[PDB]
Amino acid sequence: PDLNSIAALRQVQTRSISPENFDGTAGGGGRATEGTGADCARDLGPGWKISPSVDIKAGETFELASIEGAGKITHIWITTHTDNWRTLILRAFWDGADEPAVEVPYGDFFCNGWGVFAQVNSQAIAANPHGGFNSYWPMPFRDGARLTIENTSVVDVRVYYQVTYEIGGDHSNDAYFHAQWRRSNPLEELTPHVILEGIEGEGHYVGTYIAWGVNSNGWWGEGEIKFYLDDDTDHPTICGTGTEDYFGGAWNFDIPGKGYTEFSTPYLGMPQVIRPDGLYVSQQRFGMYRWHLQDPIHFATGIPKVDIQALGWRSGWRYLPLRDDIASTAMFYLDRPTARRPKSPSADDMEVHLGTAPVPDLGATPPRVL
Amino acid sequence: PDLNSIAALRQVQTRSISPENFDGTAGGGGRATEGTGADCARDLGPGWKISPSVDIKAGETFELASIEGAGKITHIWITTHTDNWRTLILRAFWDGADEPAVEVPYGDFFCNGWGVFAQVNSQAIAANPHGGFNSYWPMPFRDGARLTIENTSVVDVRVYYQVTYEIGGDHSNDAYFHAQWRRSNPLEELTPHVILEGIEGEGHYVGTYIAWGVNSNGWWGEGEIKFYLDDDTDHPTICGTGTEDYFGGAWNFDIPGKGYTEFSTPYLGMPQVIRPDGLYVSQQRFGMYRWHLQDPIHFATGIPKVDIQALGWRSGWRYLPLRDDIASTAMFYLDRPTARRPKSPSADDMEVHLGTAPVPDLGATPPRVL
Amino acid sequence: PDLNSIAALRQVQTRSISPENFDGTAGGGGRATEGTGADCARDLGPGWKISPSVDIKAGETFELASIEGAGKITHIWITTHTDNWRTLILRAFWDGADEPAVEVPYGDFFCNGWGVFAQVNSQAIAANPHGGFNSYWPMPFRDGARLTIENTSVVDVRVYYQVTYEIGGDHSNDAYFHAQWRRSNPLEELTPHVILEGIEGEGHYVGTYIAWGVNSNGWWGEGEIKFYLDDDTDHPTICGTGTEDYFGGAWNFDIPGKGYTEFSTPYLGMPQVIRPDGLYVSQQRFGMYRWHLQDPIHFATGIPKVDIQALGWRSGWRYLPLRDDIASTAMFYLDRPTARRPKSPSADDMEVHLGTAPVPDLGATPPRV
Amino acid sequence: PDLNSIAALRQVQTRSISPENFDGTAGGGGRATEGTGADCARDLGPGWKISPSVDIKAGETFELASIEGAGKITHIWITTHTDNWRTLILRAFWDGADEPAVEVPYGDFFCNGWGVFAQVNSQAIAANPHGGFNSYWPMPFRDGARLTIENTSVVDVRVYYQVTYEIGGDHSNDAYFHAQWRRSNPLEELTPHVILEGIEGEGHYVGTYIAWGVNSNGWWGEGEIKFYLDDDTDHPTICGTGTEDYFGGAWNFDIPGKGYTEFSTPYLGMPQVIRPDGLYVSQQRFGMYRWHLQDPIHFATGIPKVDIQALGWRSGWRYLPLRDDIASTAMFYLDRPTARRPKSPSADDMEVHLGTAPVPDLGATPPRV
């Protein structure tokens, strides 16, 4: 429900999967006698926070949640240290499918793909101090749900999480939640950055998060977003007017006398502006989201292409093709649990620089000395 | 309705009770010739802000709103000076019930339990400069409604209010809105702070505001929330992983280089961080809220217990049971107009220090000096 | 002697026990070839700071001093790191007794019960940069003395110390030095904090140090101190008028426009004000001492009770009973080497949070991790 | 006793007189059911700070302490709001005498004659935040003692106090404590300010506190102190070399690059420097004390005169006789309970401006409007 409909009596059950209730059973929480907090509770009884988190060994995948039957995820809360935001891969599989519908680097799913905490005050995503990541995207499913997180790094990783969902609804006409990630670094000359390609089915596009690192001086966001829907081949159905325009800003996000200004509204934001520090943090980077909740982009047959140009300015008032560092996360609902995906994100494609030192390992927490 | 459904035509009437229209009648507003504004308008006349507020004498209860028939409150606005935020009790009675379904200290109901204004940008609660307290919790009723505000303080109190409601909808399947408040100060050793106890009926839990003052050094919010629903006894169905975790945050609310950081999002917030001033304002305090609107916690026959652990840190990585000052406000919808309640809040249990002086009466507005 | 009487020739001997002369014997100092400094002097010979300190293993007790016969301790210097100020227990045993007359956490004995250095300029106690702890309380004894320090913590600790004493002169009529510790956290509703209880004998009360952490807003120091002496039962002989009053301050220690002001005088002080930093050091705390040296509180048959009220302010000009964090150290002289004392301090009720980080182990030196 | 002698056992009783124990009797404290704190304790039970203070109505005198028999006051603690430091007169009468031995404005007794708080860390006098006034001057008597506070102001005042004393000692060769006050505003030209005059008996001079407000530019402390003792007539036995000199400073109290510097040591101090604010607080004022404790100034048959010159500088390296505002408090011990005194201080001669506003009533707490 929502504020408007919260009062209606509904025959629904609410369940919640955490490290204190791995399977989310009724009456099954807080029973652990082993866990990451056991030694901490050694002078207290059982039931005093024995199992708040899990450790995922380097290279391994952990099953956050396994649900049987029909249901709908209504709220995901999760945290881990910033160092892992671009080493963990978050995946969701609906209805027993062998391929995931959601396959995203952890940080980007919460508009935090740079490993530097940015506050996000939106409706679908809340990202709160410090690295408290919340997803309210409804994720309904008809015949099972699997959520996993893969630690592609060389170090062991600690993760806290809480997956809340509903049982007892009819999801026969609910679509499946999908999310996909692509990174161009550096984008090829005069080539749009692909956001989505080759999606088949009925559904609607509902979200874009972009992490953009700029390699040219001047304004970098002239490029237009383009939605090729259904029958479209060589020209899109929805064509935009700029990068900041798409994300609801205008005129370079530039408030006279203040510069680039972070903002974060229910459907539109640029929650992140990273400014170089004159030493080893040398890349100017941006994070921007737009949710199409009141204005979804429906498609009856498919989405052949969603892409966005990367244009700035050069002398003589000419557009400048940008060789920039662009990562997109596209959110969409579909009447199937799988669709064409890009190649799985590798450790190497995902990597951003860890700290503020000259070497990632020197600014990791704690530093890595080998 | 909401933004998505606001265009639809509906056979519904809107009414609003205020000191300028005490009973809400149509054509009934602005007729006062006596009131708190009458002398202010002695050179004007009737119709020029004659009756904007009410004066509630010390000890006495004022009936904000009496409504007959079926209806639904859609928006409450109310204000009063900060000195009264923890001396007034807000109450709501549905369907002619002898007992209140809402029984809350005034400030807590708007996430402001400490008497120090804090901005709240949430969906259900908006608290604005300076002490503009707004509630958008829908409160449906089938056979009448009464709202009251009790002045438990030794001074007369001024209150402005605007209670907006609808007539003409079907509430036979709408739950009733409830809210309950409990404070433990200091929390007993090894004792979860009880948020909600013994609720019988069908319904769903939708909101927590906690006012927390900390009596140990170090981090204070390791403790987990536990929801015992339906048949639960010894173990909860939903077990949390931490106090900041439950409220959408992570890692102590601690942004590196900034410390505790206030935030306020549609469903999650720590709107308030009170820092000691090194003189008479010596208690470090927090206010936190979570609304379970997209993700309500349902129950079919009851809520035996909701509670939250108060755990900090001791040497040797040991949880420290905290003897802290913890006040909780719990919001839930129920299919009955009454339910098991804590003891009624009293002047002594609600009291927080007034102002910044060594004596509450010195810092009151105006100073009492009696 | 003192400044007034220092010129007099006296048939007295001065000795001094330190890690460089463990038994304090004439000509016994500086002989070590092993000790905590030996390797530091590997390129120098012996006699170059070979044994300046001792290491005390986790859990273990170390005998600082053992003196045979009659004497008087005249000055104790001692130091150790911040993290050990509320983990070490200092004890003194007089005349071969099995029960100690002094049983006090290390830091409280030098007005430093919070593990944060505060300068103390008093006559009996001098606490100097950084953690140079000095006691000049004279401690006479007739038939032996033992000083011990117990490491109740889980780590090993370094201690430097120097215990200076005198042999000669009659302690026929010199009382014994006693010191006892009690902490209420949180204090019971509307209940005085006990400072001293059930003491029997002849003597005089000479010292109070209190470490006070406040859990209510407003002014916390209205409570009066009360001395029940000799035949007293339900009412005291000496009844104070406030907490800051007892400690020689007034009007909340609050100098207008500057707030709480630390001071330290020969007999009266508030040497420590700890203000919260708005992050993990969230407790506002105080350190206060009064030495009754020119104005001893005598008793002839005992001290039934010494207590102090914990009172602040509530709405309506009402006292507010304070559920506060109060630790007291009482100093008194007694005509017996033993007295009835509280339950020994444990590691747990002594513990104060270490450092400024979210977990004590993260703020320890070095971090425990 | 003191630190050097604190350990000795002594057949002495300690008593303390306060608003909570008006007569100091054993088992007598904390019994009140009426008092200034009774309404404050209305929600608590008996014994919770019912009687911590006294209200002295405008114009009236209040008897702080009345003691019968032999005894010795060992410590006085007292406080009241700064507005009253120069409207209250503190008096002490020994052995039933009809005239006081101590007759001093309240603030001056504690080196605070200007109504602006100044820390004093001295041996005999401790003045602590904010207005905690402490005297450790021992005051022996042989046949009773009376301590009074006179409120010469037109408003009611609140006082908190604690008078601690001993019984048991033999005071038959203990002198009586005396203190006297004299103000010259403005001092007549080329006329020494009289500190003490015509004292008859055996004793010793033990203290000077001077409150000095300067009405000429340049350095104001050239003038030197003179003690006329015993058979002295036209010339003194002790002749000092300067005003800062007498108070233990040198070269104008002026540290290069810092100006006048406050300091408070066990016997010597300039605890107070008051700098004009450029508006209504326009008088540059100083507070200075010297205790002659280790160096008492002895007399066998009396003190004809103690005085001090007020000399500054004019052009041509000539002394400038100063028309200055000089109040002194002389402490001395005498073998008699009474001595020759100045006129009692009046409200008008004691008055100092209250606050910082144009009119004293506007700067009082609260304003008298």
DSSP strand pairing (C311-314 vs C238-239): unpaired
CB-based contact, C315 to chain B, within 8 Å:
yes
Q: What angle do CA C250, C254, C258 make, to 5 degrees?
A: 150
- Assigned token pair, B91: 């109450």
Of B285, B47, B62, B71, give the one whose Cα is nearest residue B185.
B285
Nearest by CB to C360, which of B282, B314, B359? Answer: B314
Residue B199: count other Cβ atoms within 10 Å of its Cβ.
24
Nearest by CB to D128, which of C140, C171, C249? Answer: C249
Buried b (16+ CB within 10 A) or exposed e, C202-224: bbbbbbbbbbbbbbbbbbbbbbb
Reduce the DSSP state of residue B268 to 3 states and report it: strand
Of B89, B77, B102, give the one whose Cα is nearest residue B149.
B89
The terminus-to-terminus CA distance of chain D in angstroms comes to 50
Identify the closest residue of chain D to C224 by CA–CA distance: D49
DSSP strand pairing (D157-167 vs D268-274): unpaired
Q: Which residues contact A83 (CB under 8 A, 6 or more apart)?
A: A115, A354, A364, A365
Reduce the DSSP state of residue A370 to 3 states and report it: coil
Amino acid letter, residue D281: V
Chain centroid to Cα A29, Å, comes to 28
CA dihedral C63→C68→C71→C77, nearest 10 degrees, is -20
Residue A214: count other Cβ atoms within 10 Å of its Cβ.
19
The terminus-to-terminus CA distance of chain A in angstroms comes to 52
CB A15 within 8 A of CB A168: no
Find the farthest-apart pair of alpha carbons in chain A and give their distance in angstroms, rounded: 74
Dihedral over Cα of B122, B127, B128, B133: its sign: positive
- Residues 230-259, chain C, touching D (beta carbon < 8 A): 230-233, 235-242, 244-245, 247-256
Of A137, A297, A92, A290, give the one whose Cα is nearest residue A203.
A297
Identify the closest residue of chain C to B214 by CA–CA distance: C282
Of A153, A166, A175, A135, give the one whose Cα is nearest residue A329.
A135
Amino acid letter, residue D296: P
Q: Which helix (H) or strand (E) holds B364?
A: none
Nearest by CB to B218, which of C275, C314, C359? Answer: C359
Measured distance CA(A82)–CA(A88) in Å, rounded: 11
Counting every residue written for chain C, the total comes to: 369
Q: What angle do CA A21, A26, A30 make, to 5 degrees?
A: 35
Q: Which helix (H) or strand (E) holds C195?
A: strand C193-200
Of A318, A352, A330, give the one whose Cα is nearest residue A104.
A330
CB D59 within 8 A of CB D74: no
Measured distance CA(B316)–CA(D92) in Å, rounded: 60
Chain centroid to Cα C278, Å, comes to 29
- Assigned token pair, B256: 């590196």
Place of tokens 């004390």: D289
CB B145 within 8 A of CB A25: no
CB C211 within 8 A of CB C287: yes
Cβ neighbours of C3 in D, within 8 Å: 294
Put simply, the answer to whether A294 touches B267 (Cβ < 8 Å) is no
Dihedral over Cα of A187, A191, A194, A197: its sign: negative
Cβ neighbours of B311 in C, within 8 Å: none
- Assigned token pair, B10: 């509906």
Put simply, the answer to whether B218 touches C275 (Cβ < 8 Å) is no
Place of tokens 């006051």: D73
Query: Which site among B245, B295, B320, B336 would you substitute to test the A interface, given the most A Cβ atoms closer than 10 Å to its Cβ?
Result: B295
Buried b (16+ CB within 10 A) or exposed e, B161-194: bbbbbbbebebeebbbbbbbbbbbbbbeeeebbb
Cβ neighbours of B317 in A, within 8 Å: 39-40
DSSP state of C5: G
Measured distance CA(C179)–CA(C89) in Å, rounded: 12
Beta bridge partners of A320: A312
CB-based contact, D360 to chain C, within 8 Å:
no
- Assigned token pair, A358: 């000259």
Query: Which site among B136, B237, B243 would you substitute to test the A interface, given the most A Cβ atoms closer than 10 Å to its Cβ?
Result: B237
Identify the closest residue of chain D to C299 by CA–CA distance: D13
Dihedral over Cα of C300, C109, B218, B312: its sign: negative
CB-based contact, B276 to chain C, within 8 Å:
yes
- Residues 130-149, chain A, touching B (beta carbon < 8 A): 130-134, 136, 138
- Assigned token pair, A309: 């140009």
Beta bridge partners of A181: A329
Measured distance CA(B350)–CA(B185) in Å, rounded: 10
Counting every residue written for chain A, the total comes to: 370
Put simply, the answer to whether B216 touches C283 (Cβ < 8 Å) is yes
Rg (CA), chain C: 21
DSSP string covering B225-257: EEEE-TT-SSS-SEE-S-HHHHTT--GGGEETT
| Å between A233 CA and nearest CA of chain B | 32
Cβ neighbours of C236 in D, within 8 Å: 21, 27, 29-30
DSSP string covering C22-83: TT--TT-SS--SSSTTTGGGTTS-TTSSS-S-EEE-TT-EEEEEEE-SSEEEEEEEEE--GG
CB-based contact, B314 to chain C, within 8 Å:
yes
Put simply, the answer to whether C240 touches D20 (Cβ < 8 Å) is yes
Task: Give the method of determination.
Answer: X-ray
Cβ neighbours of C313 in B, within 8 Å: 358-360
Of A201, A209, A89, A109, give the one whose Cα is nearest residue A150.
A89
Measured distance CA(D29)–CA(C237) in Å, rounded: 6
CB D29 within 8 A of CB C235: yes
CB C328 within 8 A of CB C226: no
Reduce the DSSP state of residue B92 to 3 states and report it: strand
DSSP string covering B3-30: TTTTTS----EEEEEBTTBTT--TT-TT
DSSP state of A83: G
Q: Which residues contact A31 (CB under 8 A, 6 or more apart)?
A: B235
Reduce the DSSP state of residue B335 to 3 states and report it: coil
Put simply, the answer to whether D7 touches C139 (Cβ < 8 Å) is yes
Place of tokens 């008008």: D348
Q: Which chains touch D (3 or more CB pairs under 8 A)?
A: C
CB B124 within 8 A of CB B137: yes
The CB-side HSE value for D183 (13 A sphere, CA atoms) comes to 21
Nearest by CB to C177, which of D7, D8, D136? Answer: D7
| Å between A308 CA and nearest CA of chain B | 28
Dihedral over Cα of D260, D265, D268, D270: its sign: positive
CB D225 within 8 A of CB D307: yes
Query: Which site among C238, C293, C301, C336 would you substitute to test the D interface, given the most D Cβ atoms closer than 10 Å to its Cβ?
Result: C238
Measured distance CA(C56)–CA(D172) in Å, rounded: 55
DSSP strand pairing (C225-228 vs C132-135): unpaired
Measured distance CA(B102)–CA(A184) in Å, rounded: 55
DSSP string covering A2-69: -GGGTTB----EEEEEBTTBTT--TT-SS--SSSTTTGGGTTS-TTSSS-S-EEE-TT-EEEEEEE-S
Measured distance CA(B344)–CA(B358) in Å, rounded: 29
Q: Which residues contact C47 (CB under 8 A, 6 or more apart)?
A: C30
Place of tokens 């379904």: B101
Of B328, B268, B326, give the one whose Cα is nearest residue A129.
B268
Place of tokens 């039933």: D96
- Cα separation values, C309 from C223, C233, D43, Å: 4, 17, 16
Measured distance CA(D134)–CA(D151) in Å, rounded: 20
Reduce the DSSP state of residue B307 to 3 states and report it: strand
Nearest by CB to D8, which of C173, C268, C297? Answer: C173
Dihedral over Cα of C29, C33, C37, C41: its sign: positive
Beta bridge partners of A159: A54
Measured distance CA(C76)–CA(B230) in Å, rounded: 66
Phi/psi-derived region of residue B98, left when phi > 0, alpha when psi is between -120 and 50, beta in every other case: alpha
Residue B75: count other Cβ atoms within 10 Å of its Cβ.
17
Buried b (16+ CB within 10 A) or exposed e, A74-86: bbbbbbbbbbbbb
Identify the closest residue of chain C to D118 by CA–CA distance: C255
- Assigned token pair, D79: 């406080």
Measured distance CA(B135)–CA(B125) in Å, rounded: 5
| Å between C194 CA and nearest CA of chain B | 20
CB-based contact, C172 to chain D, within 8 Å:
no
Q: What angle do CA B85, B90, B92 make, to 5 degrees?
A: 165
Chain centroid to Cα C212, Å, comes to 15
Task: State phi, psi for C251 to the nearest 5 degrees.
Answer: 50, 50
DSSP string covering A214-281: --SSS----PPEEEE-TT-SSS-SEE-S-HHHHTT--GGGEETTTEE--EE-SSEEEEEEE---SSS-
CB B179 within 8 A of CB B91: no
Burial class of residue A263 in the structure, from the number of CB atoms within 10 Å of its CB (0-12 exposed, 13-18 middle, 19+ buried): middle
Measured distance CA(C119)–CA(C114) in Å, rounded: 13
DSSP state of A188: P
Measured distance CA(C217)–CA(B276) in Å, rounded: 9
Structural gaps in chain B: residues followed by a C–N separation over 2.5 Å: none
Q: Per residue, what are the HEC states of chain D?
A: CCHHHCCECCCCEEEEEECCECCCCCCCCCCCCCCCCCHHHCCCCCCCCCCCCEEECCCCEEEEEEECCCEEEEEEEEECCHHHCCCEEEEEEECCCCCCCEEEEHHHHCCCCCCCCCCEECCCEEEECCCEEEECCCEEECCCEEEEEEECCCCCEEEEEEEEEEECCCCCCCCEEEEEEEEECCCCCCCCEEEEEEEECCEEEEEEEEEEEECCCCCCCCCCEEEECCCCCCCCCEECCCHHHHCCCCHHHEECCCEECCEECCCEEEEEEECCCCCCCCCEEEEEEEECCCCCEEECCEEEEEEECCEEEECCCEEEECCCEEEEEEEEEECCCCCCCCCCCCHHHHCCCCCCCCCHHHHCCCCCC
Nearest by CB to C315, which of B220, B357, B360? Answer: B360
Of A1, A13, A5, give the one whose Cα is nearest residue B171.
A5
Measured distance CA(B267)–CA(C368) in Å, rounded: 38
Measured distance CA(B105)–CA(B108) in Å, rounded: 6
Place of tokens 């009720």: C349
Identify the closest residue of chain B to C251 by CA–CA distance: B358
Residue D173: count other Cβ atoms within 10 Å of its Cβ.
7
Q: Which helix (H) or strand (E) holds A328?
A: strand A325-334
Put simply, the answer to whether C140 touches D7 (Cβ < 8 Å) is yes
CB-based contact, C164 to chain D, within 8 Å:
no
Measured distance CA(A166)–CA(A176) in Å, rounded: 15
Nearest by CB to B259, which of C275, C278, C359? Answer: C278
CB C237 within 8 A of CB C229: yes
CA dihedral D330→D333→D338→D341, nearest 10 degrees, is -10
| Contacts by residues A359-364 (CB-CB < 8 Å, ≥ 24 positions apart) | A364/A83
| Å between A65 CA and nearest CA of chain B | 14
Nearest by CB to C263, which of D8, D129, D133? Answer: D129
| Å between D32 CA and nearest CA of chain C | 11
Put simply, the answer to whether A28 touches B138 (Cβ < 8 Å) is no
Chain centroid to Cα A249, Å, comes to 21
Q: What angle do CA A121, A124, A125 make, to 5 degrees?
A: 50
Place of tokens 């536990």: B226
Put simply, the answer to whether B229 touches A26 (Cβ < 8 Å) is yes
Measured distance CA(A280)–CA(B196) in Å, rounded: 52
Of C269, C301, C274, C299, give the one whose Cα is nearest residue C285.
C274
CB C298 within 8 A of CB D13: yes
Nearest by CB to A42, which of B296, B318, B335? Answer: B318
DSSP string covering C131-193: TEEEE---EEESS-EEEEEEE-SSS-EEEEEEEEEEE-S--TTBPEEEEEEEEETTPPTT-PE
DSSP string covering B135-159: E---EEESS-EEEEEEE-SSS-EEE
Put simply, the answer to whether D136 touches C267 (Cβ < 8 Å) is yes
CB-based contact, D55 to chain C, within 8 Å:
no
Phi/psi-derived region of residue C30, left when phi > 0, alpha when psi is between -120 and 50, beta in every other case: left
Measured distance CA(D110)–CA(D118) in Å, rounded: 10
CB-based contact, C62 to chain D, within 8 Å:
no
DSSP string covering A125-176: EEEETTTEEEE---EEESS-EEEEEEE-SSS-EEEEEEEEEEES---TTPPE
Place of tokens 């006279």: A256
- Assigned token pair, C238: 């000496």
Identify the closest residue of chain A to B266 by CA–CA distance: A123
Beta bridge partners of D141: D71
Dihedral over Cα of C84, C87, C88, C90: its sign: positive
